[PDB]
Subunit: 307 residues, 4 copies
Amino acid sequence: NTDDIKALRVITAIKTPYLPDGRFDLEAYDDLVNIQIQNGAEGVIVGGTTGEGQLMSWDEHIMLIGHTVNCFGGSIKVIGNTGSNSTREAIHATEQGFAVGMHAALHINPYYGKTSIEGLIAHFQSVLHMGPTIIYNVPGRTGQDIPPRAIFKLSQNPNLAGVKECVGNKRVEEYTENGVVVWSGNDDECHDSRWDYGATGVISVTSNLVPGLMRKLMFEGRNSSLNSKLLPLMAWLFHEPNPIGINTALAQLGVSRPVFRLPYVPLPLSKRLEFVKLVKEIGREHFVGEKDVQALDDDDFILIGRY
Amino acid sequence: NTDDIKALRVITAIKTPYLPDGRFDLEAYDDLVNIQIQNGAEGVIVGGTTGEGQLMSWDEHIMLIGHTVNCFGGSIKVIGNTGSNSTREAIHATEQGFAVGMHAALHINPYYGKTSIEGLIAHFQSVLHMGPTIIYNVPGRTGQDIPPRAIFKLSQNPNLAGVKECVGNKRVEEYTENGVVVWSGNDDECHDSRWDYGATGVISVTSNLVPGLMRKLMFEGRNSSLNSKLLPLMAWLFHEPNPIGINTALAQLGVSRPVFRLPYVPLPLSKRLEFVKLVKEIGREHFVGEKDVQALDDDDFILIGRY
Amino acid sequence: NTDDIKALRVITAIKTPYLPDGRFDLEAYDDLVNIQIQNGAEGVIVGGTTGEGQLMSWDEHIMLIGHTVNCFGGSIKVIGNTGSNSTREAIHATEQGFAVGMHAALHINPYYGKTSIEGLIAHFQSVLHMGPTIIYNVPGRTGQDIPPRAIFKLSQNPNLAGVKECVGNKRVEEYTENGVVVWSGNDDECHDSRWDYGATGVISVTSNLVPGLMRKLMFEGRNSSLNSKLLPLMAWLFHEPNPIGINTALAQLGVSRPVFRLPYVPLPLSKRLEFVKLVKEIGREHFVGEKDVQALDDDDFILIGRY
Amino acid sequence: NTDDIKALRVITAIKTPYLPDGRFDLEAYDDLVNIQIQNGAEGVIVGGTTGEGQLMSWDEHIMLIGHTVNCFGGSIKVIGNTGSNSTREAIHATEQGFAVGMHAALHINPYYGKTSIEGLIAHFQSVLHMGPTIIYNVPGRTGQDIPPRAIFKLSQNPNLAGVKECVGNKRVEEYTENGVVVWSGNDDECHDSRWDYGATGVISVTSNLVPGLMRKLMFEGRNSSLNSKLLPLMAWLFHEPNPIGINTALAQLGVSRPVFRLPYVPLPLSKRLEFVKLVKEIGREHFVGEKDVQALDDDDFILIGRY
Ligand code: NA
Ligand code: NA
Ligand code: NA
Ligand code: NA
Ligand code: NA
Ligand code: NA
Ligand code: NA
Ligand code: NA
Ligand code: NA
Ligand code: NA
């Protein structure tokens, strides 16, 4: 049901942890999702940009969606990232994702092989009838900014829950004043987005580390001091393109193995030492896991091309 | 070998034509490649952006590469587009494409899931050892500008044939003054790139329509007035994102069926009528095929999502 | 848990119904599984021989397993047919099947590319540690009879629940007297298997049609008159190789569309008219669905090669 | 064309050799194919039962077919094993194999998921129109004997080159007396099949080891005493199911690494010592490779499940 999706305020784009041969580490993944549920996250994106959906084959991606539904689906909404630059793959992945029980789909506009606005309506109308859907706009990654007029045409459809918008707060405000539900896709704008520009909440990378504090930020009212205490951590997470930062941090916290699927590689030791300092300044009690944060050596990280 | 790739001036990024149910039309495709050869095209990109590689399953893509080598590889250089935003996919695709006899690989940087410069080097080093390689920079589509210092680093590998560059002539000139071979990836700049900025030639969309005129433009010296005559056709071809124009034009000339794989959809009737006038203005004798150019009705087009 | 698997007496090898384009018809499939649960079936095999697992790609097979777990897993045991003649595919399919929540795996010995008894131990030891497993012996289909000494070596493993045995009642008796749990794989021997030769129950094709009567046969004591009332129906179901008969019958009952994935084709009209007679003789009230049985025309059946 | 396939007498079902991690060893493979050509083998089956097609993903299989055509197709006929128990897979594999330039297809009847005779005709008619085809009957592996009346029906299609027959010489003679071309698929019968029962030649495992002697046996007339000399080697090659013997022997001769994809595992040391004596008895000069034959230690072998 679309209404239940519209009501979510804190959705985590969860990291996908790996075994040293490159396969998914499901035991670490289950720990991560349980920690999200214990700290009040309401939805998870499975295999989103942060979860490296772009590196998965479809069988391991549908497996990870079905696993998340089967183990956690009664305790958290499971939103499968089933969009694609290929309409055929978007159709196939979305209907299989809904068949294994996911609650909603996250759909990006076709990236790299971008299409016309007419082709973009055709793409989205291919999948929207399948179930509750959030459309995702991030032109810095896709090469194409979805214009609001396209979203307005698509919200005829009762399955469009709303938009994950990365353009910025002026675009968030244009949508929310036109009655479209919006989740900020930018951790470092989401507090203002929520309290000043009518956003419902955030689909977050930073909640992978501090899910309790992100929930506080979206639920307890304007808190501009909590916000600026999180800003240095947010900057660190985006120093190189996401998920490089989160992959590095979860490995330092010991909740994920230091295993990267290429083309991602970790942040260097100088940044890893800043992370040890950030954990101390914010307080280890707010971060996921209970192990002592480690700096790690560069040689701890396994970079895998063939898996 | 690499030197033979570096010598190519006219490389057509060939359109992939379809049967009425979405499968590849190999008879139409073979007609296109033969026409290219007969008009002096010296290389083809198989399954590039123009060839909708992004919409192919890997089995039909490797099949199209091996078929092109088997039928035409003694008459034209066959360059497989075996790049990906996933290093795993780029490694497998590339080694398999070389195993079936392609002469070179085209490698884009990771789009959408963009990585750090260090990750970008690791990605390209994963495939550069496999055979002659052209690196493709198109930040308008990928979200990321490959910096010259990464190219200078990678050019130490003797398998780097050069770069397909879309940033513009000032970037072309920075490479070519330093000894890196460049093909312009922008048809509307390629004449000046070739004669004024040291580009070896072009990896062209427009050559799918007027391969003889593109050949003349790359070999017979500066000719502003020929260039000026082609600019309106080139503008039309990129009115919407490629390959929407070329797919519409080739259906109008009768050399490809009017079948689109989504998310691409044809240009509207007013643009198709403009194309009929472009062909008459330039001269039908310069365009591929023998059939009279047609406007086509909207109803002639078949759009396919499930294939 | 293996003990819970050992205790099952009536497992249905459920048919996989199709839409006219060849995709799975999940709405019909859900009706079928609900009807099994309402008539007391205790387990279902998903994508077994009867379910045409051999014709599925792995993504649709894992999807169908995850779907069955998510919709029915609290009401019936879900046993994924994840075995293969390739050890690599067996490993991959089994661990993904268990990850989406299936309760057990059905594993055939490598068919067609058969291996030595030493290779067969190596194959099974690759997957047995993954969770509760039933080994399936059907030399009439595989070309290789698994010798009891191999099963005895493998029952060291607490995950081996038992064997689905198709060789016949003398082989069932050799296993059960040696303390191996056995499910008869032959509907027309399963009554004697159960009451005279120590079999626990049956993994059945016939239960797809008359699940209530098959449950009666396995639970209520020796009933040789009920058995011989079912014998003509059982013979009909195996007149050509299974699943040809069941696919034809479910279409006649209107619970499945008359759509066959090749290489299967339906029984001819003379056999379909015998089925109408069998339903009347046994009583429509005992068969799945509520629609009036139809003979169907040959032209009702859609035979699909490309899907 | 078909006539050129019908003329072949010596077809080697080539072994597929592996690198230490399970990937294909193309350098070893190319050495094997060159040795076959140099000893007068006239065709190769790529990825047949002997070549472990059953263990390949389709991408590596089409790659191996296109590679063989690209490197050797001007010197030897390349027959792809593109058959399957799934018609969908047989259709796709076969059309793609012909598109990359294979000269013929080898098609087994559906094994394990066996179908009715009518279904069997529908399966083969799905692929026979695609190019020259050899039908493979091996009921010991498939569970089903293709009846002569199905072959007589299918031979009306001019693309049927003939049959690889394993039932024995009486079945060979029934075909050949009626004008159907037969290759014996049984090495230990092929001499008599060739000279006494009208077989055109052999699709051979033993030719991977002694291709010159197999050629002599197929071209230079009856020679019982040469045949008798090879029988012990042929017996050894099928002591366990093929390809276990040939994979062990080629590792002992040094022309393939001692790497097995599961579920195959090497013959034990006593059989390997017997092989060293067979080579000495027949003469090393007749066996492929130049290196001294070795027994190998059990520890030299690498068995791989995950690759
Ligand atoms: Na804590
Ligand atoms: Na914690
Ligand atoms: Na120049
Ligand atoms: Na012309
Ligand atoms: Na022309
Ligand atoms: Na009833
Ligand atoms: Na009923
Ligand atoms: Na003869
Ligand atoms: Na020799
Ligand atoms: Na030799």
